[PDB]
Design an enzyme around this catalytic site. Sequence first.
Site, PDB file in Angstrom:
ATOM      1  N   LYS A  43       0.881  -1.854  -0.207  1.00 53.84           N
ATOM      2  CA  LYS A  43       0.173   0.404   0.075  1.00 53.84           C
ATOM      3  C   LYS A  43       1.026   1.245  -0.126  1.00 53.84           C
ATOM      4  CE  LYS A  43      -4.201  -1.563  -1.101  1.00 53.84           C
ATOM      5  NZ  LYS A  43      -4.078  -0.934  -2.075  1.00 53.84           N
ATOM      6  N   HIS A  98       6.316  -7.875  -2.205  1.00 58.90           N
ATOM      7  CA  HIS A  98       6.171  -6.754  -0.700  1.00 58.90           C
ATOM      8  C   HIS A  98       7.630  -7.156   0.186  1.00 58.90           C
ATOM      9  CE1 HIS A  98       2.715  -4.434  -2.314  1.00 58.90           C
ATOM     10  NE2 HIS A  98       2.610  -5.376  -2.103  1.00 58.90           N
ATOM     11  N   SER A 128      -4.337   3.187   4.406  1.00 54.20           N
ATOM     12  CA  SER A 128      -4.634   2.737   3.575  1.00 54.20           C
ATOM     13  C   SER A 128      -4.494   0.903   3.660  1.00 54.20           C
ATOM     14  CB  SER A 128      -3.740   2.599   2.151  1.00 54.20           C
ATOM     15  OG  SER A 128      -3.390   3.758   2.227  1.00 54.20           O
TER      16      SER A 128
HETATM   17  C1  LIG Z   1      -2.847  -8.513  -1.933  1.00 52.76           C
HETATM   18  C2  LIG Z   1      -1.356  -8.127  -3.410  1.00 52.76           C
HETATM   19  C3  LIG Z   1      -0.274  -7.634  -2.450  1.00 52.76           C
HETATM   20  C4  LIG Z   1      -0.791  -7.368  -1.334  1.00 52.76           C
HETATM   21  C5  LIG Z   1      -0.563  -5.795  -2.731  1.00 52.76           C
HETATM   22  O1  LIG Z   1      -0.142  -3.861  -2.431  1.00 52.76           O
HETATM   23  C6  LIG Z   1      -2.472  -5.941  -2.672  1.00 52.76           C
HETATM   24  C7  LIG Z   1      -3.073  -6.565  -3.518  1.00 52.76           C
HETATM   25  C8  LIG Z   1      -4.359  -6.382  -4.333  1.00 52.76           C
HETATM   26  C9  LIG Z   1      -3.964  -8.199  -5.587  1.00 52.76           C
HETATM   27  C10 LIG Z   1      -2.954  -9.637  -5.068  1.00 52.76           C
HETATM   28  C11 LIG Z   1      -1.259  -9.252  -3.756  1.00 52.76           C
HETATM   29  C12 LIG Z   1      -1.142 -10.395  -3.834  1.00 52.76           C
HETATM   30  C13 LIG Z   1      -1.208 -11.396  -5.047  1.00 52.76           C
HETATM   31  C14 LIG Z   1      -2.374 -11.955  -5.670  1.00 52.76           C
HETATM   32  C15 LIG Z   1      -3.540 -12.474  -4.439  1.00 52.76           C
HETATM   33  C16 LIG Z   1      -1.996 -12.756  -7.226  1.00 52.76           C
HETATM   34  O2  LIG Z   1      -2.056 -12.959  -7.559  1.00 52.76           O
HETATM   35  C17 LIG Z   1      -3.609 -11.584  -7.592  1.00 52.76           C
HETATM   36  C18 LIG Z   1      -4.564 -10.906  -6.699  1.00 52.76           C
HETATM   37  C19 LIG Z   1      -2.989 -10.487  -5.934  1.00 52.76           C
END
Ligand SMILES: C[C@]12CC[C@H](O)C[C@@H]1CC[C@@H]1[C@@H]2CC[C@]2(C)C(=O)CC[C@@H]12
Length: 267
Positions: A43, A98, A128
Amino acid sequence: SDDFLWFEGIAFPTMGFRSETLRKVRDEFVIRDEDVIILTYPKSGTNWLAEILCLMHSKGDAKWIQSVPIWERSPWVESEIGYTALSETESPRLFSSHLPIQLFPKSFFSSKAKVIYLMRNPRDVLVSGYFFWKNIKFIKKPKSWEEYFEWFCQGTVLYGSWFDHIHGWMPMREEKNFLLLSYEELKQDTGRTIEKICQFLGKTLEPEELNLILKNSSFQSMKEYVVDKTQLSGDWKNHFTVAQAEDFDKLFQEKMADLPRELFPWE
Ligand SMILES: C[C@]12CC[C@H](O)C[C@@H]1CC[C@@H]1[C@@H]2CC[C@]2(C)C(=O)CC[C@@H]12
């Protein structure tokens, strides 16, 4: 029923992730000197930065970028869907992560792969995260704002401590394959930031390609499984009580003491 994947001292979302993969990311994933990685604490502006990069590659044409979804333009290597796609993609590869430095791919540290690290005022990050995460199914939710505030401060949140995350990555801020950026400067002047990214990546653009890029990557242009559909505002000052702010400055002061204060633009 803990509501999260615990791995190597860091909590991850239940759905979409797996330990065995996380283990392979650190031990097996092979990184190429041509790969470009967006590094951020969750975020902090990843999507915006992904946009800029994708626009730079497409020379401003927001065509493909429009259809193709975020997790496809710069997939997260630590995720199932992510690890898979990257494993069969032909360099050059653009991906996000991340992951704190101690869980990042080993192969990276002996490569020339370029990394862009984006940081943001932790106060905005905390807000956020609060609104985003509390609006996502199956992941542990805070009973209240005050409670989430405490988790973030203590590091007990998805992906761990913001403080640890910054300390672990900062030691590379002077490497030639590491570009450090702040969300603040990204917002204050996208032009300046885009120029840094071009210089860092060694890309050049025709005046008219930059023109288009600058237009499709402005803050306004950015304004584009889930509990409530709504939330999908204001600023951190509309959420932090004056007491929470005084307590946060103190904590920030203590925690970041061993790092140059001017490294962080925000107050
Ligand atoms: C939660 C997040 C990683 C933390 C981010 O700042 C908010 C992102 C939303 C989309 C997510 C992602 C992790 C990996 C995911 C699950 C995928 O591979 C497709 C959707 C992806």
